[PDB]
Amino acid sequence: QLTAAQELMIQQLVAAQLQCNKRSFSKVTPWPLGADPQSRDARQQRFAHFTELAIISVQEIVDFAKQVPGFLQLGREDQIALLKASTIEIMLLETARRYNHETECITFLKDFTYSKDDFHRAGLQVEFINPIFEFSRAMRRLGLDDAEYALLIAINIFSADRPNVQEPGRVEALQQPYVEALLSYTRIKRPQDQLRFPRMLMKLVSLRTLSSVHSEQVFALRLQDKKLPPLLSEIWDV
Ligand SMILES: O=C(O)Cc1ccc(COc2cccc(-c3c(Cc4ccccc4)cnc4c(C(F)(F)F)cccc34)c2)cc1
Ligand SMILES: O=C(O)Cc1ccc(COc2cccc(-c3c(Cc4ccccc4)cnc4c(C(F)(F)F)cccc34)c2)cc1
């Protein structure tokens, strides 16, 4: 019982997500192969490889948001305020989406697959990596399809409570149709489990905390002179 209008909205979202991601292929610094043991330079090269993946992701996320129906109707100031806050959360959703529970690794851009050890080997701290993997496993147990991921991202974008939002009324009104679509879609997909929808919305709660956990990781780089490139530092370093 999805209405025609809801079906159309969902098609648009899934088509946009697909196109934007394919556009992230249409060259990152390599993962260091052939390094010496305990190497300063190897570690920095790993970190640099990761910062460049993050820079690819942020561009994909902005490109996707611009395609989300209603986003560009908002004032430009609100567009920026919404994307600034949602970028890390959407990035962690797309990360969770690429977790393989069999291997316990994350695969980025098809070719780049990494373990907890590999993230640690690049200089990221256990206090950040562990909750990300915990979240990824919890996301895996939900079994979201492409429509559910796209809808959840749209809902995340139109959060009226982000810092410096000018027209929170308009933002909340834009969130409504996407919340309503996800409610309808989840009922049809799994009618016997009436909790899958609350459990999904609850992942937005966890993402808020992960953003805070991420802020602490960013801060921990300041007392080990391992700083972010300027682009990432602008959106992430307070
Ligand atoms: O834009 C492009 O064509 C390509 C591109 C894609 C990604 C990035 C880096 O990744 C991000 C992620 C979250 C937001 C922005 C961001 C934008 C970006 C933006 C654009 C349109 C609507 C909304 C947001 C614009 N202006 C910002 C400003 C300000 F002070 F206002 F100048 C401050 C802080 C962030 C921003 C950037 C930079 C470029
Ligand atoms: O694959 C596709 O098709 C699309 C796609 C392409 C790329 C990506 C993201 O790619 C990555 C890969 C490795 C790390 C990050 C990264 C994160 C995010 C993060 C952190 C730990 C583990 C997983 C993810 C957060 N913070 C970082 C910081 C910090 F200092 F903390 F600011 C520094 C450097 C990297 C990071 C990002 C997603 C989707």
UniProtKB/Swiss-Prot annotation:
Q: GO molecular function: any one?
A: apolipoprotein A-I receptor binding
Q: In which tissues is it expressed?
A: Ubiquitous.
Locate residues linked as Glycyl lysine isopeptide (Lys-Gly) (interchain with G-Cter in SUMO2).
K189, K227
Give compartment(s): Nucleus
Please list the residue ranges annotated as the NR LBD domain: 5-238
Q: Which UniProt keywords apply?
A: Activator, DNA-binding, Isopeptide bond, Metal-binding, Nucleus, Receptor, Transcription, Transcription regulation, Ubl conjugation, Zinc, Zinc-finger
Query: Which effect does the record note for changing K227R?
Result: Impaired ability to act as an anti-inflammatory role during the hepatic acute phase response
| Gene Ontology BP, a term | negative regulation of pinocytosis
Q: Does the keyword Protein biosynthesis apply?
A: no
Q: Fill in the PTM field for this protein.
A: Sumoylated by SUMO2 at Lys-189 and Lys-227 during the hepatic acute phase response, leading to promote interaction with GPS2 and prevent N-Cor corepressor complex dissociation.
Task: State the GO CC annotations.
Answer: chromatin; cytoplasm; cytosol; nucleoplasm; nucleus; RNA polymerase II transcription regulator complex
Chain spans, region Transactivation AF-2: 2-238
Tell me, in one coarse class, where this protein mainly resides: nucleus
Instruction: Give the family from UniProt.
Output: Belongs to the nuclear hormone receptor family. NR1 subfamily.
Q: How does it assemble?
A: Forms a heterodimer with RXR. Interacts with CCAR2 (via N-terminus) in a ligand-independent manner. Interacts (when sumoylated) with GPS2; interaction with GPS2 onto hepatic acute phase protein promoters prevents N-Cor corepressor complex dissociation. Interacts with ABCA12 and ABCA1; this interaction is required for ABCA1 localization to the cell surface and is necessary for its normal activity and stability.
Q: What does this protein do?
A: Nuclear receptor that exhibits a ligand-dependent transcriptional activation activity. Binds preferentially to double-stranded oligonucleotide direct repeats having the consensus half-site sequence 5'-AGGTCA-3' and 4-nt spacing (DR-4). Regulates cholesterol uptake through MYLIP-dependent ubiquitination of LDLR, VLDLR and LRP8; DLDLR and LRP8. Interplays functionally with RORA for the regulation of genes involved in liver metabolism. Induces LPCAT3-dependent phospholipid remodeling in endoplasmic reticulum (ER) membranes of hepatocytes, driving SREBF1 processing and lipogenesis.
Name of the molecule in the record? Oxysterols receptor LXR-beta
Species per Swiss-Prot/TrEMBL record: Homo sapiens
Whichever gene encodes this chain, its name is NR1H2
